[PDB]
Design a protein around this ligand. Sequence first.
Ligand SMILES: NC(=O)N[C@@H](CC(=O)O)C(=O)O
Ligand SMILES: O=C1C[C@@H](C(=O)O)NC(=O)N1
Ligand SMILES: [Zn+2]
Ligand SMILES: [Zn+2]
Ligand SMILES: [Zn+2]
Ligand SMILES: [Zn+2]
Lengths: 343, 338
Amino acid sequence: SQVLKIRRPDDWHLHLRDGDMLKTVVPYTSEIYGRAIVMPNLAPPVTTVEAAVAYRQRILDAVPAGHDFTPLMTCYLTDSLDPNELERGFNEGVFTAAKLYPANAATNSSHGVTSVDAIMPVLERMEKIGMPLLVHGEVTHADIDIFDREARFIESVMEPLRQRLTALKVVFEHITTKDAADYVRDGNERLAATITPQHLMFNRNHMLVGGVRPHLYCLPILKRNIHQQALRELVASGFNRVFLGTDSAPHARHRKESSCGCAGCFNAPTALGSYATVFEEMNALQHFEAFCSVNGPQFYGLPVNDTFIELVREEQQVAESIALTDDTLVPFLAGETVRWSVK
Amino acid sequence: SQVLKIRRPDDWHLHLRDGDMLKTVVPYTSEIYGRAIVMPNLAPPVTTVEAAVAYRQRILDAVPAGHDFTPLMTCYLTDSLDPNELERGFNEGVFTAAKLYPANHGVTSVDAIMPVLERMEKIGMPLLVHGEVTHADIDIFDREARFIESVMEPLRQRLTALKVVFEHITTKDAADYVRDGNERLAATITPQHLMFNRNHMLVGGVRPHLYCLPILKRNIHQQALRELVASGFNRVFLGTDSAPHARHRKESSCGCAGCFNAPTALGSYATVFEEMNALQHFEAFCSVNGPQFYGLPVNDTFIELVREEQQVAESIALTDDTLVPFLAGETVRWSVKQ
Ligand SMILES: NC(=O)N[C@@H](CC(=O)O)C(=O)O
Ligand SMILES: O=C1C[C@@H](C(=O)O)NC(=O)N1
Ligand SMILES: [Zn+2]
Ligand SMILES: [Zn+2]
Ligand SMILES: [Zn+2]
Ligand SMILES: [Zn+2]
């Protein structure tokens, strides 16, 4: 059976949570990926150097003996963040990047951004010092249809911001639309993107035909098939400013399978093999390694990993669930037979 | 303070289920509505007069003493249904209508059931249509509009005397189609498709209790539906599509489609018509338009709605698990007096 040997990958978009959940989920990342961009949306969010240092240590504490795994921390951008605090964290090697979540005029200044215009001082500082901005590019105005929120962000925020701050480096995280695919494809060397396995593998029909499937419910929402196909064609093209970002985003089963299910797919256990399946189906396996292991490092200005892992094309069964201290976690593709697995 | 007295309504699109669920859910309908169109998608479906007779009795058994409720039964169309069985049930006053569910025991094509539809047209039996195509490569939000072009309009062009109700319409496409139709075409609209759009199901979390078929659409469609009922157009009428499922069948890795809206629909419709400055058309929608299309007398009793905020129960007890009502735990602006 067939083997794909690649330089050890990294995960450029990850949620590790905290406490007991962190302890459970970290190994699924640390056994496979050399590094991961660790998102800062804890409760409360990671908005200071001190919090990020402490969080980094909790993550490191949870890494099993012998895994060579480095968490790359992020700062959650808020209205009240001091640009001097962000800069110090960047300078000290604590913050690899800063994350911008959608603006909301009603957000507490300690927990988020009211409008992009309101945090220009901090965005200018990142431009000045060369710190990459990671963007969850949606506008969340109550009068915008949810399937439109990504496209509206491009027009309303992304293009204006990049015109205003022409040296700013930006990753358009977890892109989900042809709009974003074209936008990133047509951008310059300062603009990149991550794509999750679920947005390559599925479209909204998979979440809604035959039943509603909360384990496919994530933000940005799965879009119509034309968008799925655009994403697939983008990674398959060999375009070298798109790279692996799982957006692995774990929630307890009872929080997913409820009257108001949380957004996020726990895909760390099955993501790498899921990407291999997509690249294989697109006849584009020659671009697979770069996506997983080269493009991200290149964009972030970091070294490519010098060790290797192998995927084997032999069928395995994904666990139905993964025990937590309380409740259980349902992994992405739970119970399914998958095509590629790590040797 | 404000009181609104209407002719007693009917529900022209209802799911009552069977067994213990039936016992639980019938009183929420029977206490209010004079009649309801009882859908036949049981497991197995109601495809014979004999099955429809026994089901009707199970329903009547579960109606509390003192409720004057009459269930109007329907036949589940299948590809091989004998037209004589359908006609016999009609002639015996058992079947009021027949329901067309696209496969995915449902109907695989209109061509396979032409002789059944031709008999319905001859005898004047209305055809109730779940108007969605189901091909795997058609996006779920497009399935209603595609049905209109590819099935509905060809069908109506072929059987020009057939009376059709376009059930639970959800789109501007269907709203315009019905608005511009002739007197042999009508529609029902649920409370959920008037009150919400897909954002309410998907923004801030996924809400399976708002997941139903046809799927909630974009806001421009919700608005079209609200304008249609508010216009006074007299070939749209109340059909709740109350479609109960136990809580943990809704709240699961693959949640069932349907809203249990019988407890709150009437009040919910009142809120919509009020918001649309269209309470003058509310009675007709609830209590006149349906009977007129079906050729049945209007009800001869009256009820009162009062604009006093009632809190909707968080859940309703079942033998096993619970049933979560539409708008569970929320407030409804209108309640039924006494
Ligand atoms: N509408 C729904 O979402 N559910 C109905 C089926 C139907 O009306 O098609 C049901 O019977 O559960
Ligand atoms: O934007 C996000 C946040 C993430 C999470 O749960 O943290 N889950 C998602 O689905 N995407
Ligand atoms: Zn995000
Ligand atoms: Zn994320
Ligand atoms: Zn239906
Ligand atoms: Zn129905």
